[PDB]
Amino acid sequence: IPTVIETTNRGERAYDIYSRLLKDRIIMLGSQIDDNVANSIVSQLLFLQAQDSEKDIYLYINSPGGSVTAGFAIYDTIQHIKPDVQTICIGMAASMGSFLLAAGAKGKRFALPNAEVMIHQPLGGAQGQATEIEIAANHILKTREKLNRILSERTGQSIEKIQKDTDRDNFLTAEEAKEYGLIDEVMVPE
Amino acid sequence: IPTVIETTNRGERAYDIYSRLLKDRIIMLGSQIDDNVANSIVSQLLFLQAQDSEKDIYLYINSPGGSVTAGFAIYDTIQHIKPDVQTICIGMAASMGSFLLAAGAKGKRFALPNAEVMIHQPLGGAQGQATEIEIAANHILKTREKLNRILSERTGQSIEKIQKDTDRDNFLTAEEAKEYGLIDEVMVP
Amino acid sequence: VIAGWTGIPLTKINETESEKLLSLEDTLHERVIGQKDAVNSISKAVRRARAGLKDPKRPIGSFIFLGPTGVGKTELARALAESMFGDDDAMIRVDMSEFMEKHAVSRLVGAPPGYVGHDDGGQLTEKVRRKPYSVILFDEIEKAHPDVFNILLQVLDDGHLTDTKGRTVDFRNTIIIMTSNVGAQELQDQRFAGFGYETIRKTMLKELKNSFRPEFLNRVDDIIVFHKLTKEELKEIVTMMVNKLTNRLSEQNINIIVTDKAKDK
Amino acid sequence: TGVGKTELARALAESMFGDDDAMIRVDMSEFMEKHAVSRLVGAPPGYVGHDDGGQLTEKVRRKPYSVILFDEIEKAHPDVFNILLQVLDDGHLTDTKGRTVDFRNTIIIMTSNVGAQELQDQRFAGFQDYETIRKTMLKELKNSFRPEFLNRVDDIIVFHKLTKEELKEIVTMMVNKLTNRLSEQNINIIVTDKAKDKIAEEGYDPEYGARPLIRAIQKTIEDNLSELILDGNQIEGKKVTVDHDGKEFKYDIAEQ
Amino acid sequence: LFDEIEKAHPDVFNILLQVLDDGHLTTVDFRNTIIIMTSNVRFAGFG
Amino acid sequence: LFDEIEKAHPDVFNILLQVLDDGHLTDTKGRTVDFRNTIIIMTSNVGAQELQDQRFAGFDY
Amino acid sequence: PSVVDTVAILKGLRDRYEAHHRINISDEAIEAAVKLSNRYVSDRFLPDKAIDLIDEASSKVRLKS
Numbered sequence A: 001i002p003t004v005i006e007t008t009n010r011g012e013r014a015y016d017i018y019s020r021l022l023k024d025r026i027i028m029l030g031s032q033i034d035d036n037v038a039n040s041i042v043s044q045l046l047f048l049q050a051q052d053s054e055k056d057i058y059l060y061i062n063s064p065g066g067s068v069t070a071g072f073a074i075y076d077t078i079q080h081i082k083p084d085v086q087t088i089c090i091g092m093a094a095s096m097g098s099f100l101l102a103a104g105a106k107g108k109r110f111a112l113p114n115a116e117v118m119i120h121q122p123l124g125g126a127q128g129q130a131t132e133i134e135i136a137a138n139h140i141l142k143t144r145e146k147l148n149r150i151l152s153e154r155t156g157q158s159i160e161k162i163q164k165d166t167d168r169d170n171f172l173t174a175e176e177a178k179e180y181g182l183i184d185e186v187m188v189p190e
Numbered sequence B: 001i002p003t004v005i006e007t008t009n010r011g012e013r014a015y016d017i018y019s020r021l022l023k024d025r026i027i028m029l030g031s032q033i034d035d036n037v038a039n040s041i042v043s044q045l046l047f048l049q050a051q052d053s054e055k056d057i058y059l060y061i062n063s064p065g066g067s068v069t070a071g072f073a074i075y076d077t078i079q080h081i082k083p084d085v086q087t088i089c090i091g092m093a094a095s096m097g098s099f100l101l102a103a104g105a106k107g108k109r110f111a112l113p114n115a116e117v118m119i120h121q122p123l124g125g126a127q128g129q130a131t132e133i134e135i136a137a138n139h140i141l142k143t144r145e146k147l148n149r150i151l152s153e154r155t156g157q158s159i160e161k162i163q164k165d166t167d168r169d170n171f172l173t174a175e176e177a178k179e180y181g182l183i184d185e186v187m188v189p
Numbered sequence C: 001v002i003a004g005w006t007g008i009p010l011t012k013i014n015e016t017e018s019e020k021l022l023s024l025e026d027t028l029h030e031r032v033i034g035q036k037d038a039v040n041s042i043s044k045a046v047r048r049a050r051a052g053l054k055d056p057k058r059p060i061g062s063f064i065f066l067g068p069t070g071v072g073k074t075e076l077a078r079a080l081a082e083s084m085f086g087d088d089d090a091m092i093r094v095d096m097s098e099f100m101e102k103h104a105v106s107r108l109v110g111a112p113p114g115y116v117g118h119d120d121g122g123q124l125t126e127k128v129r130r131k132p133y134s135v136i137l138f139d140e141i142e143k144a145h146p147d148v149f150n151i152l153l154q155v156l157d158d159g160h161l162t163d164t165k166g167r168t169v170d171f172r173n174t175i176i177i178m179t180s181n182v183g184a185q186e187l188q189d190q191r192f193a194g195f196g197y198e199t200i201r202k203t204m205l206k207e208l209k210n211s212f213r214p215e216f217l218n219r220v221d222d223i224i225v226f227h228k229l230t231k232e233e234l235k236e237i238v239t240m241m242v243n244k245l246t247n248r249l250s251e252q253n254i255n256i257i258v259t260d261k262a263k264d265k
Numbered sequence D: 001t002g003v004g005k006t007e008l009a010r011a012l013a014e015s016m017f018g019d020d021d022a023m024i025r026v027d028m029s030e031f032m033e034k035h036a037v038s039r040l041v042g043a044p045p046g047y048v049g050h051d052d053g054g055q056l057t058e059k060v061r062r063k064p065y066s067v068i069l070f071d072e073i074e075k076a077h078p079d080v081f082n083i084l085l086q087v088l089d090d091g092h093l094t095d096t097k098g099r100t101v102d103f104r105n106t107i108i109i110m111t112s113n114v115g116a117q118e119l120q121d122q123r124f125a126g127f128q129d130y131e132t133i134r135k136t137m138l139k140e141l142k143n144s145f146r147p148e149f150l151n152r153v154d155d156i157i158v159f160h161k162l163t164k165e166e167l168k169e170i171v172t173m174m175v176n177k178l179t180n181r182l183s184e185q186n187i188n189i190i191v192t193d194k195a196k197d198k199i200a201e202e203g204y205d206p207e208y209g210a211r212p213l214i215r216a217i218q219k220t221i222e223d224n225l226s227e228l229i230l231d232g233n234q235i236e237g238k239k240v241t242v243d244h245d246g247k248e249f250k251y252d253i254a255e256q
Numbered sequence E: 001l002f003d004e005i006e007k008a009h010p011d012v013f014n015i016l017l018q019v020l021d022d023g024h025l026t027t028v029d030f031r032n033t034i035i036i037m038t039s040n041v042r043f044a045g046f047g
Numbered sequence F: 001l002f003d004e005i006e007k008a009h010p011d012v013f014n015i016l017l018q019v020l021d022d023g024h025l026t027d028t029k030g031r032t033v034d035f036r037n038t039i040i041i042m043t044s045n046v047g048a049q050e051l052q053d054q055r056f057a058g059f060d061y
Numbered sequence G: 001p002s003v004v005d006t007v008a009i010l011k012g013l014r015d016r017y018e019a020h021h022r023i024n025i026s027d028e029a030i031e032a033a034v035k036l037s038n039r040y041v042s043d044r045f046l047p048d049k050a051i052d053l054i055d056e057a058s059s060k061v062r063l064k065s
Ligand SMILES: Nc1ncnc2c1ncn2[C@@H]1O[C@H](COP(=O)(O)OP(=O)(O)O)[C@@H](O)[C@H]1O
Pocket: C031, C032, C033, C034, C035, C068, C069, C070, C071, C072, C073, C074, C075, C179, C181, C237, C240
């Protein structure tokens, strides 16, 4: 993790690359979405809303996926803060990562040309008595229903079609994601 | 964890994002509640009370829960301090997390729209001779009774209803938690 | 005769002077768009001085202008100097950016006996002595060393400053203005991070207390926070600058008009 | 700050001599440099200003019976106070020229506020009286000064923070002084008790002493009176009564 | 002619702004002067 | 009597080296004044403040 | 001298200055001179500066007519 000494005026303070990018409202999500990463992302979003409530935030996503609750926390923080958030898909946005990719501001969801996205039903487990298995199954089914409803709202597609497509691992290219509605346009190179 | 640098005439302040939030009286409960986390949170609450005893303290909860004793320490510190403690549920609030979520000031307990709250009876374990197992079971039943008593006092629900609901893992949405009395209102964007 | 000697307007207040003093806010607003409270406080101080209700043992007024960059604090001081004298050059301006070191306070009061430059007293003391009715501006007080302002403690409370030679200079007929700047990053960092003008003024005032001693702020007559310029205020500023330029080019017999869209751009 | 440390010295000077002017005042906020000590005793031989002598020594020689005020002692360089060690022990100070000046018929008053801010920014993070306050401020004074300097001082006095009733009495005194000053300008002013109470409550600020009282008196009485004076001179040779009906201050003009 | 405005003490910029905004210093007039400030403004790699 | 010798600049006492070693001090006029029949007393309290500042953190003349 | 002493001094010297400047000097002029010189002139000292103020004002008003 290289450090950067480049700062305006005095130029005495040194940053690491992520902290320096944070000053430019650049947020990096390049790992699995667990509670620690989600908490850091929420704190960064709140800090950037406080710094300026009008300028847009840049969210670069590259994640295999992770906890559904962590992604829900990030989604709520994104939809709650006044400034708009741009989601740029780097590499792969899969599982909850694709959910956060669709969470960006309308007309402000982008993806790089040779990028990949994946959508599927949530994973989980249920162990113990039959009643406990029933409770866990009900919870995971309700979680899938809520995810499908949010995706349908943010993509403008029927929940039947999303249910059919999320049955198995559906891999989509950037163009296929654009046609599907997860992203808005493919960032053509300069 | 990113670092935030603030420039003043006196000098440089190098916060990490959690300390920067703490500067605005934001305390983050985002991990399993063990002794270390409870001690840190108690110290943060005490320092925030010292800095100004009149403004409100904000507690953000995203945790699967943890130790009952640690949660009780946090609850005691919250109730003892003069400033009000607003509890906002981001993500998950399970076991002790829900207990601390309900422990905020009245009219000041919030949860994000698609947040999840889980209430259930505490976990434990007994091993050894029959007398030792009896002691452990008596202790865990007493702890469950105390938790049910506090939850009934703090949510307006009967002790019997909480006993029935906490027998198995009960998952509640934000609307269900508002109806159950665990939180006070959902934060509309 | 005493007014001619000291330069202080001690003559009787006539109707013309009365109406000129009562319209001081309008005169200051002719050069300073915005910042109503600062203009009001300055005008009240001047009117109180000229009504004879000022405490004779204290200066006319001590003010701290706190706000962002390019808001008009120095411009307000210059406008006050123009109102009180007729020209901005009569103002006594002290640049606090060259007072970054503690020993630079010798330039204000003089060098101690046995040290170079003791024959020539402090610049500020000599300037005030020769112009007892003056406006003193301390520009960018944050850049100065914190201990330099301990000298002003005896001036804001008693109106007397003693130079190294032993001569006492009276500041009791002067207006003292200190300007403090908070950068864009500074007041960006003062905002609250979390879910969900009064608070901005409160937090800037609280931050000011952490940079100056309580007994220094206790002796200031008024601490005024300069609000950020709005859209219509910037439009009015463009209008006033364009009007000044049109007058200056009309005295050369060149007629010029600027459209509203051009001014907005 | 704003408690009465300097006002007490001025009051003593007035009581002893009939005027606050007849007090030898040394503001030590201009002695932040060690070499400023020359201002007290003069420049050494062979250096500029040697013939002028020491200002304090000459003033004391010219008036051996006087009150000497060293205002804001903590503002000066620590070593500058070694010059006062001989004065507090023998009443003697030697000029650079070699002349011994007698201080044995003088009252030396030193004012400070060290530790006063420390009692306000102290924050206990875990779950008072005059004695503890004076103890901690004396401890801070010991920290800020050398033991031999504090050992020669006849008395160290703690000035307590003003209370509400004392603030009200201070308001009464300020109003009386303002009224007596304006009577010379032929402006009779009477301020009622309700108005004085509202001034005291509006200008209440516990850690700033009685200077908010001055600011409140200004903003409440002097601005409106100045407007009346400048608005066609409708006050001259008349009596103005300042009242507070319960919402704002009212100013009524009548005859003597 | 301001030779080498770089390593000069930063207080020179104050005087320069004062001259360029007002044209007078304390009086000396600068309205008939031309202000010329001459400024004098390794790769770790294979290139 | 030299009272409170620590209060002076350290270099000032270099002038007393000749006085304490030969009893001679040459003034500026080039005249040598003899100190050989004088008693010189220098009072000080060096280390007094260190000693009222020294606090022992672990559990006489 | 004090302010009242200076007033008495100026009132006593009034006859000489009235004879020299051939004008009338009012008591209010004496009071104003001493008070204004005492408050606003600090480098000089009371009797001389009050007399100076009286003399300059008298000269100006005499040359006016
Ligand atoms: N309210 C205002 N009305 C008129 N002019 C303004 C106003 N605010 C800013 N300006 C203009 O902008 C410039 C601000 O510079 P200045 O206030 O001196 O900077 P600083 O506040 O950093 O000292 C001035 O030249 C002034 O003409």
